[PDB]
Amino acid sequence: SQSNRELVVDFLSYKLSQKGYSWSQMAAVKQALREAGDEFELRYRRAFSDLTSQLHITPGTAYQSFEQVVNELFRDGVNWGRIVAFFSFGGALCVESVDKEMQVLVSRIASWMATYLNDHLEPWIQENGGWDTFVELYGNNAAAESRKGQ
Amino acid sequence: SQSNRELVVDFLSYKLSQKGYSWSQMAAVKQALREAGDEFELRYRRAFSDLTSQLHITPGTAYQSFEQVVNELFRDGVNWGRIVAFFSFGGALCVESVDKEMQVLVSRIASWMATYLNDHLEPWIQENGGWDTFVELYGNNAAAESRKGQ
Amino acid sequence: STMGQVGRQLAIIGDDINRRY
Amino acid sequence: STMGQVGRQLAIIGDDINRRY
């Protein structure tokens, strides 16, 4: 069963990451982004209130909601922190959709995010060191440890 | 890029799980097992020392090491806690392999785990409520919260 | 728009958490 | 064996963390 293999890889990836190892480069990117997203959401909450609490979405307007936000986020630039913001926004929009019994939108939002990444963020990412550089900058929970020290 | 979709799904799965939601049934199983493994390893460490500190493995004896442990773990029974132990053991064996510059073994151990799950644990799992029951018993970090209360 | 203002706030916090070598 | 004894210890802790309805 391919499901059993996926469960094994998930668990082993997690335990390797706790020791500073990684199952794969992709696994290292995933973990650093999870950590950066947690930290982003903490900082956002303290300055502006929780990201989920301010979102409006209905199935008939879901793309409009997505693009209105993402277009402003990247209107005047791309950088690693704004890429983290983009992921955190998508997560919050999915949580809000589930809260409001609009579960159908989770799959749509995931697709819109992947397409936006492919078309509009990947060019910048490839010119700025790729996801390997993101891991160098954000791995080992680096953004949170920075705030914790100050 | 399929890599961008996988990163999106990982992040969204994580953020949904933090709110008590799940991307999929499999995502819920993964998270409950991660949590159960952390708790297992904590309990094991307190009673018997860290699970990685006691493992012996070389590439020439890696399967022997795996089966010597797993055969005794399940010699006189299968239950959800021992299934968690099995995952934690595999994680520790992978960490030890990487520590000792035997990275080639990680992929082998993952395969041996998936095969053992398929052949020798799945029959029990399907007779005892399936992974859905595991999530009912272990989801929401339930094993750790039990110890925390006592 | 209201969602536009969320995007602006995301950019502000994104710039705060932005990291450089 | 040494690894056999690890398996026995895993079973002991597995029984401790085992949960029932």
What size, in residues, is chain A?
150
Binding-face residues of B in 46-75 toward A, CB within 8 A: none
What phi and psi, each to the nearest 5 degrees, are found at residue B145? -65, -30
Q: Check: CB of residue B10 under 8 Å from CB of residue A34.
A: yes
Say which residues have a Cβ less than 8 Å from residue A37's Cβ, sequence separation at least 6.
A84, A87, A88, A91, B11, B14, B15
- Pick from A84, A124, A150 the residue to mutate for testing the C interface (most C CBs within 10 Å): A84
Residues 1-20 of D with CB under 8 A from B: 1-20
| Torsion from C-alpha of A84, A87, A90, A92, nearest 10 degrees | -60
Residue A43 sits at the vertex; the CA angle it makes with A38 and A45, to the nearest 5 degrees, is 95
Chain D contact partners (≥3 CB pairs within 8 A):
B
Contact A74, A123 (CB under 8 A): no
Q: How far is CA A61 from the centre of its chain?
A: 22
Q: What stretch of H or E contains A76?
A: none
> Is there a contact between A70 and A81 (Cβ–Cβ < 8 Å)?
no
CB pairs under 8 A between A and C: 93
**Contact in structure between A106 and B23 (CB atoms under 8 Å):** yes
Distance from C-alpha of A59 to C-alpha of A105, rounded to nearest angstrom: 7
Interchain CB distance below 8 Å, B82 and D2:
no
Phi, psi angle pair for A55, to nearest 5° = -95, 140
Tokens found for residue B107: 């992929």
Question: How many Å apart are CA A35 and CA A22, to the nearest integer?
Answer: 15
How would you class A119 by CB atoms within 10 Å of its CB: exposed for 0-12, middle for 13-18, buried for 19 or more? Answer: exposed
In the numeric block, which tokens belong to residue B5?
Answer: 């979709």
Query: In whole angstroms, what is the distance from residue A69 CA to residue C8 CA?
Result: 8
Quick check: B147 and B43 in contact, CB under 8 A? yes
Q: How far apart are CA B19 and CA A126, in angstroms?
A: 33
Helix axes A25-48, A130-138, angle to 10 degrees: 60
Pair B107, B62: CB distance under 8 Å? no
The identity of residue A105, as a single letter, is L
The DSSP letter of residue A23 is S
Q: Is B117 on the interface with A (CB under 8 A)?
A: yes
Q: In this complex, is the C-beta atom of A71 within 8 Å of any C-beta atom belonging to chain C?
A: yes
Subunit contact D11:B75, Cβ cutoff 8 A: yes
Residues 6+ apart with CB under 8 A from C13: A40, A43, A44, A47, A48, A81, A85
